[PDB]
């Protein structure tokens, strides 16, 4: 276990600083040159690492990142650098004879069969899905569009099946980790990342650490009830924030409001977050009102979170950030009016660096597993 | 450094779950039989540990536990078990000639001079107080009752003056750790402890770690907005929890509504929190209304915190715990109504085991330093 951390800490460095020397790794990782020698030599003998100084070897090593969303599975074969080999997306019908679990395995098998020739060593699967997720054990408790899913052993069934580690994460936590490693929150101690998407929620980084990291519970603010009379949520409650502020719910609402309007510009195109944001940025009062509304709800909850966590940055990750110039000040205003001035004083509401499209976040699951060394040791089996 | 972590882990499992043999510790603390003999022996030598299995030897190992409050200082001499040896309190006037740091040091000096024959080995001094605290450097940045406190190096100075380690912490943080160690939350790796007195605060442990351990910030629930039409808070915003749940506001409101409700039992006695709670339990409509009122406000925040943190235990530390039969069900019901079913399902809202009068909390600071092995390393110094 001590071995596990050390290897990962040294891999991290090679990854981040390579070309880098054995001598340098020694001081930076605070580890005896002898330990560094040992760790590095295992890495060389596995082709996890190459010489020139030390550097990572990424081509020979692949992973699958899956993403699941409403009626769709995305699959991507990628290098450990995260470079894409092949990408597919497929129908995942919402209702079917077969359990979702199988249908999933089925899609994966088809992928390997199809692109079997592009495959180098498969190291792991990174999965990113909506729902209520035990990322420790890879259990999907409940999830949004496939009503059929209850305590689904996604992680275990897939490890059993592929013989490879399965890293499963919620979309939001995955994204938070991506922004932490590669994004807008690198080397930040205290961040709250809010995501307004098909999901509503947040990841938190406190004292430099991802809250709940590698535990079986997540930050689950999207399921704090805001309407005691609202629509049923897949969590098993009703009126959850996600019910009101998810992108899909905003758009259902806009549609209903649009139906009573004959004045709105949103009548010009099919209704999409993009047209929503486009219209609001022009001063369409309906569109603006809608975005303002979401602002108020998210602001409110974010304000509570500010009082508890005292973050340095707030990252909004969302299609609505197209309308940053309406959305962000509303969030800002809530936080200023609703959190301790001393905590709320010099807080920037800023957008996320990434838009989290496709399977891009999977890289954060893998690098994370390399860095904490868990995947690393599994790899050093050979 | 590397030796520390283990030594702390080792003392920890001997402390709670002793007597326990070498080999039983080998598997529990995950260190080789050879490493488990080494650490224990040093412990047998310095007498930190005794044989029978291995028991903690504590009677002849003292620390000074300090508590600063409104114009007052509590000093108490304690067993490493936390067993009281002697306990005194002094005047600490809000304004004086000799700076506060002096008068404090001066007080401690006098304590030792006084209780000399009862002293054994002084291991450390634990200090507990309100204010903003550099828990790391023992710097008191600011603190409520002594406006003259700015950047006070309480830690540095007392160590320099006494030569013993000096652990400083905020009331609520110390209390939160004290309930997890000796109190109502023993066993939980995850706890929200809400404190409702003249101030509203909270401590949160997730994964056996104090939230904000790595900074000077507090879980400032007191300032979360519970009422967008409420009254101004000293923070500047409106409708802060504290505005309504602080014992003071509660009595303020009771006083207001009592003034018209000449049915209130609350007319026979002067208006104390206790008479209020006594009357709520006797089913007085106003008292019960007011207590319920406070409950639903706190309940709402706690619902959000549950979704944030997923604790196993919620502890209320308050005079209002006298109304637990009323306050707690209302809080429980909020959580159940408002938070993620998975998280709301088996959660206990129970009362804090201690009221944190005096110094029963310092104890946690020392125990912690004994468990991370920092004090332990110091104590194997000689
Ligand atoms: Zn929900
Ligand atoms: Zn306030």
Short description:
It is classed as transcription. Two copies of one chain form a homodimer. By secondary structure, chain A is an alpha/beta fold.
Kindly describe this structure.
2 copies of one chain form a homodimer. Chain A has 382 residues and is an alpha/beta fold. The first copy, chain A, has 3 domains: 1-58, Arc Repressor Mutant, subunit A; 59-185 and 355-382, Nucleotidyltransferase, domain 5; 186-354, Nucleotidyltransferase, domain 5 (2-Layer Sandwich), CATH 3.30.420.40. Helices cover 42% and strands 20% of the residues of chain A. Chain A has helices at residues 2-17, 22-28, 33-46, 100-114, 154-162, 171-181, 241-245, 247-260, 273-282, 285-309, 324-338, 341-344, 362-371, 374-379; strands at 49-51, 54-56, 61-69, 72-79, 84-91, 121-129, 132-134, 139-142, 166-170, 191-196, 200-206, 209-210, 313-317, 348-351. A 5-stranded mixed sheet of chain A has the order 5-4-3-6-9, with helices on both faces. In chain A, a hairpin with a 2-residue loop joins strand 11 (200-206) and strand 12 (209-210). The longest helix of chain A has 25 residues, at 285-309. The interface between A and B is large, with 39 and 35 residues. One zinc ion binds next to loops of chain A. Chains A, B: Residues 22-31 bind DNA. Chains A, B: Belongs to the ROK (NagC/XylR) family. Chains A, B: One of its GO terms (biological process) is regulation of DNA-templated transcription. Chains A, B: GO terms for molecular function: DNA binding; identical protein binding; metal ion binding. Chains A, B: This is DNA-binding transcriptional repressor Mlc.
